[PDB]
Design an enzyme around this catalytic site. Structure first.
Site, PDB file in Angstrom:
ATOM      1  N   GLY A  10       0.959  -1.314  -0.125  1.00  0.00           N
ATOM      2  CA  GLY A  10      -0.050  -0.015   0.018  1.00  0.00           C
ATOM      3  C   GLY A  10       0.850   1.043   0.028  1.00  0.00           C
ATOM      4  O   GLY A  10       2.270   1.361  -0.074  1.00  0.00           O
ATOM      5  N   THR A  11       0.278   2.535  -0.333  1.00  0.00           N
ATOM      6  CA  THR A  11       0.859   4.438   0.488  1.00  0.00           C
ATOM      7  C   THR A  11       1.776   3.860   1.292  1.00  0.00           C
ATOM      8  O   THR A  11       0.575   3.538   2.631  1.00  0.00           O
ATOM      9  CB  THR A  11      -0.524   4.769  -0.180  1.00  0.00           C
ATOM     10  OG1 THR A  11      -1.195   5.090   0.615  1.00  0.00           O
ATOM     11  CG2 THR A  11      -0.835   4.648  -1.569  1.00  0.00           C
TER      12      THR A  11
END
Ligand SMILES: *C(=O)[C@H]1NC[C@@](C)(O)[C@](O)([C@H](CC2CCCCC2)NC(=O)[C@H](Cc2ccc(OC)cc2)NC(=O)[C@H](COCc2ccccc2)NC(=O)CN2CCN(C(=O)OC(C)(C)C)CC2)O[C@@H]1C
Ligand SMILES: [Mg+2]
Ligand SMILES: [Mg+2]
Ligand SMILES: [Mg+2]
Ligand SMILES: [Mg+2]
Ligand SMILES: [Mg+2]
Lengths: 241, 204, 250, 244, 231, 196, 221, 243
Positions: H29-30
């Site tokens: 993920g970010t």
């Protein structure tokens, strides 16, 4: 072999998912130890805070179940907290239905019966935890009852749980062969706590600072955990000995 | 609109020396109208005797239900139910319908086949057990029956004496009740023979 | 969430075996030895309290359980499975008998209910069979003294005497030698202690042996006086002291 | 999810057979043999006990022969515990009928309902079938003396003489050979024992390995009596027919 | 591979294959473009016929007077999701006398799609949606995807060869964003965008579906003779 | 019944009479109407004895489970649990409850829950059949921040009057003192309070 | 009429032995003293079936609880289980109970009303005869009764009910529950209402009753 | 073997491989962080600008719970939203019964017990997010980080997603050189920097910074987003510190 995936019998009459749950017990790499005084029951567990970003105050494996009952868990924290919340609910429901505080051994039996159902029904996994229940019971006096993922439970004069458990065990068995009695013959909980820490140090071959331990004490009509300061006091007493 | 007194009828049981008696009238009516002259209110499951007064549909229903339960009992236990045990089965079953009761006054009579002891009991419609050594009464003429039994009765009557007493107690109580009478039946029960007599009585 | 296992986990194999019942019986074979002997005037059930740790207090672990004042149970196999069966057995004695007839069930009919619970775990969706065999000793007025074995399948059989678990093959042979139909209860306790000595490795004393009897009524254990026809429980647990008395005369 | 662990106990093979029914019958073929013989004046039920130990309580045991009501009995071949579930159902079903009609249940009606329950376990619910075959011996005022069998498939049929459990192929040959229609109950008794005597996997047939029951008119004028033989009564019949 | 039998199984790299296969149904779907100014939002959809004798599948569905969407993938899944959105727009009206915010519509679709990606025996939605609306905070375009990921954009495109139109809109951004108070000019810039996703075929009169919503314009669908003006 | 709770400098005092009646018959003359739902959260009960006992038992259960999970609950939290039970079940309950508690941050607090299941935070509260007779008296004599001895007198005089006029009230005056110093039970006998 | 009296080393409960249906005496010697557990006993007034049924249900559940916990049952458990059950049924279960016993905690005496309210006391009375009995308890009770004083006070309080209340009569039943010892159940402790010998024997000359038909009944198989 | 095909199956190790696989989707993920300060907590997240077509400022990922709790997560965004929905029900339920807004440790265990429940059965998939959350209660400031196993602890600072190690390195430095505390306004600047720094491990796409905070002095113990002058001020601070 799907007999290794759910809680059904293998050809040799075994439940591998129960056995593997026992292995999850030691993932935390924490050793716990419980002993009985005359007037008290003391439970000590190693405290390890690896990350510096953690709030050390929130890192615990000792739980206050009821006013009188304390529980130390050997296993991963999510399963530990599942077990904690459930024991709290059960100890409160018991007090409402039957009009007296749930005894240590009865809560132990109830949590063991729950654990047994996971070993018999396929859709529930066992919890990867061993639960050590401690209190000063109003009928039986100082009490230690331990529950495992098999749904087994028994009472103890003293007990240890974790990876280095066998060293702590034999250390205590040696003391009780010598002492000739069921318990630590000591007036105050402060000196039973000192005994518990001292015999853990001998057995593990390691020293502790105040931040390396976490301590639970049961007396008649309450269980409480020691602050860092309460333990420092306790460690200083051991130093000058 | 008083279920216990739509159809009418009485049951009485007495203990004697090594024997019990249970007797009932034969009337079934719809208030003032007498309908049937042959409605018996005493049934038996093995050696245990049950009399039921009250609403006639519940009399018939409870008999069918206790025949059912004592049949299953016998198959599983491999012996006939005893009077003490049956009494408890009746009590459980009535109290199960606590908030929708059967409108009945059941009476149990029998001899315990092991101890030889004579046994009678009665119940209210919801299951409370009245166990008496002497006599039990039930139905629309229960006041009259209590009166007769309390005067006529004495302990340790021989079966042939006990017959005269229970008969006279029922006969004279029924004659003072509009909804009871129209014929009577008396069961004399000894350890291993049961005699059943139909009494001649006034038919008004 | 909730149980999506509504299908049996015990099914017939092509040979007509029920795998999971066979494997439960294998679990029972691994279990510690327990036995029961039927005398003319009572019944003895006995087993070893093979303690896990020496730090454990093995009196807090009761392998021999009262089910009713006149009925006791012992097992070989998985202890947790036994413990919840004892809980369900005690409750069903009430719900399906005492609350109906106002008396405790006779031995064979309580056994019949336990057998039923164990059969259901053999056929119901999403469960495994119970990994225990039970020996149930009991008295009732019309049947007298009786002893029953219950297996994971739900099958039960009455026994004059038998054994289950680890050393059952040897134990049964030994009981066949010694059992006669004129045994007094004390004779049966003596034989039970001899038989259990065969299949016990270490310490053999009142603290490593659990032994209960279905014998005479014990008014001194009832807890109240004044009702002459209530004369108290026939189930009695022999104390650590009482066992050791009979080991000196062994 | 859970699909992965589902045996599918209620599906057809490519040949249109019910796997679990077939395997249940294979299970029953290893059970103690049970024989039913129907005479003109009563029915015999004989069953062989799964090899007894010298220490089993002989008289107080009922492995094979069970009472359904006063007019109907069953011999069991298969899992005893499975049989007990179905028997308690049959006993209730008979009592429901008596309660509803004030008449003892006709033998076929009881048999059909038990067979319909077994059928259900092979078509829906995804449970294992009952590992049980029954020989029904009963009497009613419509058809008189009747023998039926049912099996895990929920199929049932009527018989003059039939066997279930072990060595039925052997037992059905011997019965087919010696059975006659005119036969009286006392001859049927002798046939039942002689047949078990020959098909048994044991060295000798003794009283303590046998359960024996008759349904006769042998009481008081047109009323039916069920006899479950005590150990001693079988032992006597074993000598009188000359097998000991 | 071994981890694609159901929506409740992670792959060793932490992927949900049943969701990725769902996403694949959109890729196979006929192209649809969405784009918006400050005053209006337009949907342009290429409708796909079965053969020369069939009707062209409806791509655009009206959800309220102020909201609608275009679909690419399984049409029945669009029908279920659009029906659910119609009910949420309705509920907002009857209970709060409030026209449903396009942002809240987005969040509600996301949470509805999500339940199907975490529970056993269900299946992900096999459809992608572009939602246009004019609410209390002006014109909006949303991109919905059956993973549950909803995205607010000035413009986008989904389905077969969508990449062409998606790059053109990325180039045109500064032009079309300011077609304020001109309906016809925003539509023609939408028609130009979809033309970047055509091969061996161009926009015919029963091929092309256009929808517009804006300040003083109810959500309305133009089809057949009423789009001849725009080819 | 005559019950009150009064806040003062050091905390709060709960007061009650000890009389329970079935019509004109005094079923119990030594009743305890001061009931503990937590170490330092108590309530005074008025209404159906069954209803207030059943409610108090459920609240003690909720607060014991609250404590297990989140530590000592506020007096406001206890009052909110009583209210939830009383309001949601208003059609089947005849319960007038005064909730009094001592936090170390919030000091003494009093909440009254009348028959509707509404909640009112007050400096002091009076309730029960006998309260009607002392509204005048209590309004005139109550001051904020009284001492322990002054507050004990205010309650004793107040309930003394309520007992004198109300036939439903009587027996002993029970009080419970809630401060930092802990928990103190007081009892005052007829032969004392009658001739005040 | 039912009473409970506390004393130094235990608690005593007593009851009359009259059962009534309207103004008629149904049972001249019924037992109103019920065993919940060996050392917890119950005295019941109100709907007769309700007090027997509620006493047996809680008595059964208390026995199972005792077996589950490996502990002697406590009176506070019997109390909590009875009150919660009676409350759930909003008074429709017409049970009025004086619950007394000894447990590891000590000696206890409680009253339970049909709606589920409970009371603590050193002396209690319940039933139609409770006012007659309470007059005697309020006249004679003192703190620190001996066993023999508590039995006398309890039986005196029941006698007030027997004589002065039409709802009570016949005999006095006592149960003594003393800390350390077995509960002793004194069935018909006092029998001051023996029926006088009748003036006459109503025993009939045999053949007085007129009979239509006889038959042997078959109870056999 | 095949122990990794079904959630809630223990491997012979004593591990739940499906939870460990969930972590990989989180690691994918970010980047998102949380910083505990004197009287509050600061949350920040990296939002990859997929395309120029993403409307700036208008794809908010930090979610409020009640009025006083901020939640940010890395991993499957829908799984995050699902967990916050549940959190909002728990906080509503708690406030309804107990009147007081849900304390942060109380709220932590509600998410903990729920996430842990999704490791107990094979009919559910574990959560594909690590969640950083907290705020201000009657006892002060609390920051938590919750993992797909249901494991959570209290944190001085926390990070998850692609830039976790870069973020954790920079957080450990703040903790060491500010042992007496960090102000709420300082933590907003530091948060901006650490997101810009941790973005190097993820730098094909350029990104949008998003910050929120609960401070007992600066937002009065309520959760507000950082906007306008204060956002731009922290963006500028971070832009200095990368060169
Ligand atoms: C001392 O104070 C003394 N007073 C005497 C007395 C009689 O008040 C009593 O409370 C006894 C105690 C019981 C004695 C038996 C052991 C258990 C305790 N109570 C009774 O005798 C009650 C009196 C009573 C109370 C309340 C009632 O409300 C309706 C009615 C009656 N007796 C009964 O209930 C009575 C028992 O019948 C005995 C019996 C046995 C065998 C055959 C016949 C009768 N039965 C009824 O009252 C029947 N009644 C029918 C209708 N009903 C009912 O609920 O109807 C429905 C439709 C709603 C179900 C209720 C029951 O002792 C105290 C201590
Ligand atoms: Mg399982
Ligand atoms: Mg007449
Ligand atoms: Mg007439
Ligand atoms: Mg007064
Ligand atoms: Mg009420």
């Amino acid at each position: 072999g799907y007999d290794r995936h759910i809680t059904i019998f293998s050809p040799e009459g075994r439940l591998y998912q129960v056995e593997y749950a026992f292995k999850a017990t030691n993932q935390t790499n924490i050793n716990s130890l419980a002993v009985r005084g005359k007037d008290c029951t003391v439970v000590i567990s190693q405290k390890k805070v690896p990350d510096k970003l953690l709030d050390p105050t929130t890192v615990s494996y000792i739980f206050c179940i009821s006013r009188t009952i304390g529980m130390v868990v050997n296993g991963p924290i999510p399963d530990a907290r599942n077990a904690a919340l459930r024991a709290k609910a059960e100890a409160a429901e018991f007090r409402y239905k039957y009009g007296y505080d749930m005894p240590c051994d009865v809560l132990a039996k109830r949590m063991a019966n729950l654990s047994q159902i996971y070993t018999q029904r396929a859709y529930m996994r066992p919890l990867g935890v061993i639960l050590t229940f401690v209190s000063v019971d109003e009928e039986l006096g100082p009490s230690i009852y331990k529950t495992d993922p098999a749904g087994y439970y028994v009472g103890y004069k003293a007990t240890a749980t974790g990876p280095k458990q066998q060293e702590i065990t034999t250390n205590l068995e040696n003391h009780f062969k010598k002492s000739k009695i069921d318990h630590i013959n000591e007036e105050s909980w402060e000196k039973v706590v000192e005994f518990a820490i001292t015999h853990m140090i001998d057995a593990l071959g390691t020293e502790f600072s105040k931040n390396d331990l976490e301590v639970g004490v049961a007396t008649k009509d309450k269980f409480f955990t020691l602050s860092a300061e309460n333990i420092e006091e306790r460690l200083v007493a051991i130093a000058e000995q | 609109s008083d279920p216990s007194s739509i159809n009418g009828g009485i049951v009485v049981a007495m203990t004697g020396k090594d024997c019990v008696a249970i007797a009932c009238d034969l009337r079934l009516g719809s208030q003032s109208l007498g309908v049937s002259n042959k409605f018996e209110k005493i049934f038996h499951y093995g050696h245990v005797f049950l009399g039921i007064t009250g609403l006639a549909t519940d009399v018939t229903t409870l008999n069918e239900m206790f025949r059912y339960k004592t049949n299953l009992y016998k198959l599983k236990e491999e012996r006939a139910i005893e009077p003490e045990t049956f009494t408890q089965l009746v009590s459980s079953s009535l109290y199960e319908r606590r908030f929708g009761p059967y409108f009945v006054g059941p009476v149990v009579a029998g001899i315990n086949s092991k101890s030889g002891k004579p046994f009678i009991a009665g119940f209210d419609l919801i299951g409370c057990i009245d166990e008496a050594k002497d006599f039990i009464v039930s139905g629309t003429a229960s006041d009259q029956l209590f009166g007769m039994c309390e005067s006529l009765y004495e302990p340790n009557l021989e079966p042939e004496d006990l017959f005269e007493t229970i008969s006279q107690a029922l006969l004279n109580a029924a004659d003072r009740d509009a909804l009871s009478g129209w014929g009577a039946v008396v069961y004399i029960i000894k350890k291993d023979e049961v005699v059943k007599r139909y009494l001649k009585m006034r038919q008004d | 969430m909730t149980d999506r296992y509504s299908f049996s986990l015990t099914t017939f194999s092509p040979s007509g075996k029920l795998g999971q019942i066979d494997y439960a019986l294998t679990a029972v074979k691994q279990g510690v030895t327990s036995l029961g002997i039927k005398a003319t005037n009572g019944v003895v059930i006995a087993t070893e309290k093979k303690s896990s740790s020496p730090l454990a207090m093995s009196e807090t672990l009761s392998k021999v359980s009262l089910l009713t004042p006149d009925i006791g149970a012992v097992y070989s196999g998985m202890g947790p499975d036994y413990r919840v069966l004892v809980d369900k057995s005690r409750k069903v004695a009430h719900t399906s008998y005492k609350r109906i007839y106002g008396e405790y069930p006779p031995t064979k009919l309580l056994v019949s209910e336990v057998a039923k619970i164990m059969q259901e775990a053999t056929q119901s969706g999403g469960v495994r069979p119970f990994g225990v065999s039970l020996l149930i000793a009991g008295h009732d007025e019309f049947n007298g003294f009786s002893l029953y074995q219950v297996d994971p399948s739900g099958s039960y059989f009455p026994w004059k005497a038998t054994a289950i678990g680890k050393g059952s093959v040897a134990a049964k042979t030994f009981l066949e030698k010694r059992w006669n139909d004129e045994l007094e209860l004390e004779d049966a306790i003596h034989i039970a202690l001899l038989t259990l000595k065969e299949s016990v490795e270490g310490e053999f004393n009142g603290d490593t042996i659990e032994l209960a009897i279905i014998g005479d009524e014990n008014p001194d254990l009832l807890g109240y006086t004044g009702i002459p026809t209530d004369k108290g429980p026939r189930f009695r647990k022999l104390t650590s002291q009482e066992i050791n008395d009979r080991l000196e005369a062994l | 999810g859970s699909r992965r662990y589902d045996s599918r106990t209620t599906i057809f093979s490519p040949e249109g057979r019910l796997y679990q029914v077939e395997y249940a019958l294979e299970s029953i073929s290893h059970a103690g043999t049970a024989i039913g013989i129907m005479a003109s004046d009563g029915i015999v039920l004989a069953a062989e006990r799964k090899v007894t130990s010298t220490l089993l309580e002989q008289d107080t045991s009922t492995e094979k022969l069970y009472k359904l009501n006063d007019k109907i009995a069953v011999a069991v071949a298969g899992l005893t515990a499975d049989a007990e579930i179905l028997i308690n159902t049959a006993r209730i079903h008979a009592q429901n009928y008596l309660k509803t009609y004030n008449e003892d249940i006709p033998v076929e009606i009881l048999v059909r309902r038990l067979s319909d329950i077994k059928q259900g376990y092979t078509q829906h619910g995804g449970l294992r079938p009952f590992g049980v075959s029954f020989i029904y011996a009963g009497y009613d005022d419509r058809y008189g003396y009747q023998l039926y069998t049912s099996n895990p498939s929920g199929n049932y049929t009527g018989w003059k003489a039939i066997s279930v459990g072990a060595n039925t192929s052997a037992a059905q040959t011997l019965l087919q050979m010696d059975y006659k229609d005119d036969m009286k109950v006392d001859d049927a008794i002798e046939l039942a024992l002689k047949t078990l005597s020959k098909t048994t996997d044991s060295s000798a047939l003794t009283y303590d390995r046998l359960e024996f029951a008759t349904i006769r008119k042998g009481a008081n004028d047109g009323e039916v009596y069920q006899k479950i033989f005590k150990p001693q009564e079988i032992k006597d019949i074993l000598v009188k027919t000359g097998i000991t | 591979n071994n981890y694609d039998g159901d929506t409740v199984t992670f792959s060793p790299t932490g992927r949900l294959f049943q969701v990725e296969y769902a996403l694949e149904a959109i890729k196979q779907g006929s192209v649809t473009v969405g784009l918006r100014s400050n005053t209006h939002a337009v949907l342009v959809a290429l409708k796909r016929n079965a053969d020369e004798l069939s009707s062209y599948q409806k791509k655009i569905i009206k959800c309220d007077e102020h909201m609608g969407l275009s679909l690419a993938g399984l049409a029945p899944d669009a029908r279920v999701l659009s029906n659910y959105l119609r009910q949420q727009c309705n509920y907002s009206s009857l209970v709060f006398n409030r026209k449903l915010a396009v942002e809240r519509a987005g969040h509600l679709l996301c949470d509805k799609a999500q339940k199907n990606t975490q529970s056993y025996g269900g299946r992900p939605y096999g459809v992608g949606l572009l939602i246009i609306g004019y609410d209390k905070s002006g014109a909006h375009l949303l991109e919905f995807q059956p993973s549950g990921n909803v995205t607010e954009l000035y413009g986008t495109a989904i389905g077969a060869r969508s990449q062409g139109a998606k790059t053109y809109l990325e180039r045109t951004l500064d032009t079309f964003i300011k077609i304020d108070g001109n309906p016809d000019e925003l539509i023609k810039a939408g028609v130009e965008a979809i033309s970047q996703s055509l091969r061996d075929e161009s926009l015919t009169v029963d091929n092309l579906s256009i929808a517009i919503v804006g300040k003083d314009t109810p959500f309305t669908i133009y089809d057949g003779e009423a789009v001849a003006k725009y080819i | 019944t005559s019950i009150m709770a009064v806040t003062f400098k050091d905390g709060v005092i709960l007061g009650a009479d000890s009389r329970t009646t079935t019509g004109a018959y005094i079923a119990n003359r030594v009743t305890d109407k001061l009931t503990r739902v937590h170490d330092k959260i108590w309530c005074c009960r008025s209404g159906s004895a069954a209803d207030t006992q059943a409610i108090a038992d459920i609240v003690q259960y909720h607060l014991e489970l609250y404590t297990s999970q989140y530590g000592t609950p506020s007096t406001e939290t206890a009052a909110s649990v009583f209210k939830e039970l009383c309001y949601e079940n208003k059609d089947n309950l005849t319960a007038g409850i005064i909730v009094a508690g001592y936090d170390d941050k919030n000091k003494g607090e009093v909440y009254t829950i009348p028959l509707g299941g509404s909640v009112h935070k007050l400096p002091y509260a009076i309730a029960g059949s006998g309260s009607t007779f002392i509204y005048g008296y209590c309004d005139k004599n109550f001051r904020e921040n009284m001492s322990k001895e002054e507050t004990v007198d205010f309650i004793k005089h107040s309930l003394s009057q309520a007992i004198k006029w109300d036939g439903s009230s009587g027996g002993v005056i029970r009080m419970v003192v809630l401060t930092a110093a802990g928990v103190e039970r007081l009892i005052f006998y007829p032969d004392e309070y009658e001739q005040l | 009429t039912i009473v409970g009296v506390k004393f130094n080393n235990g608690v005593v409960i007593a009851a009359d032995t009259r059962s009534t249906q309207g103004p008629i005496v149904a049972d001249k010697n019924c037992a109103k003293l019920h065993r919940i557990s060996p050392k917890i006993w119950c005295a019941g007034a109100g709907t007769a079936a309700d007090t027997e049924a509620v006493t047996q249900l809680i008595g059964s559940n208390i026995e199972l609880h005792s077996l589950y916990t490996s502990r002697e049952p406590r009176v506070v458990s019997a109390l909590q289980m009875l009150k919660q059950h009676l409350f759930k049924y909003q008074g429709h279960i017409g049970a009025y109970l004086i619950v007394a016993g000894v447990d590891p905690t000590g000696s206890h005496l409680f009253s339970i009303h049909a709606h589920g309210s409970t009371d603590v006391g050193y002396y209690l009375s319940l039933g139609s005869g409770s006012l007659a009995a309470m007059a005697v308890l309020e006249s004679h009770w003192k703190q620190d009764l001996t066993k023999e004083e508590a039995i006398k006070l309890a039986s005196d309080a029941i006698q007030a009910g027997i004589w002065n209340d039409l709802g009570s009569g016949s005999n006095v039943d006592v149960c003594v529950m003393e800390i350390g010892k077995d509960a002793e159940y004194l069935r018909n402790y006092l029998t001051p209402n023996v029926r006088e010998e009748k003036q006459k024997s109503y025993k009939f000359p045999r053949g007085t009753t007129a009979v239509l038909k006889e038959s042997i009944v078959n109870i056999c198989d | 073997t095949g122990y990794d095909l079904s959630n809630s199956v223990f491997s012979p190790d004593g591990r739940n491989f499906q939870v460990e696989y969930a972590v990989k989707a989180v690691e994918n993920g970010t980047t998102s962080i949380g910083i505990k300060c004197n009287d509050g907590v600061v949350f920040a997240v990296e939002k990859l600008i997929t395309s120029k077509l993403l409307v700036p400022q208008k794809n908010v990922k930090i979610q409020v719970v009640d009025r006083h709790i901020g939640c940010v997560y890395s991993g499957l965004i829908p799984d995050g939203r699902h967990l916050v929905n549940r959190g909002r029900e728990e906080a509503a339920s708690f406030k309804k019964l107990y009147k007081t807004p849900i304390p942060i440790p109380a709220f932590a265990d509600r998410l903990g017990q729920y996430v842990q429940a999704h490791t107990l059965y094979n009919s559910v998939r574990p959560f594909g997010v690590s969640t950083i959350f907290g705020g201000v209660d009657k006892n002060g400031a609390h920051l938590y980080m919750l993992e797909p196993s249901g494991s959570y602890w209290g944190y001085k600072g926390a990070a998850t997603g692609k830039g976790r190690q870069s973020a954790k390195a920079e957080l450990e430095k703040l903790v060491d050189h500010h042992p007496e505390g960090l102000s709420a306004r300082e933590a907003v600047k530091q948060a901006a920097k650490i997101i810009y720094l941790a973005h190097e491990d993820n730098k094909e796409k350029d990104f949008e910074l998003e910050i929120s905070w609960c401070s007992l002095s600066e937002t009065n113990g309520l959760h507000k987003f950082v906007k306008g002058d204060l956002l731009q001020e922290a963006i500028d601070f971070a832009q200095k510190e990368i060169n």
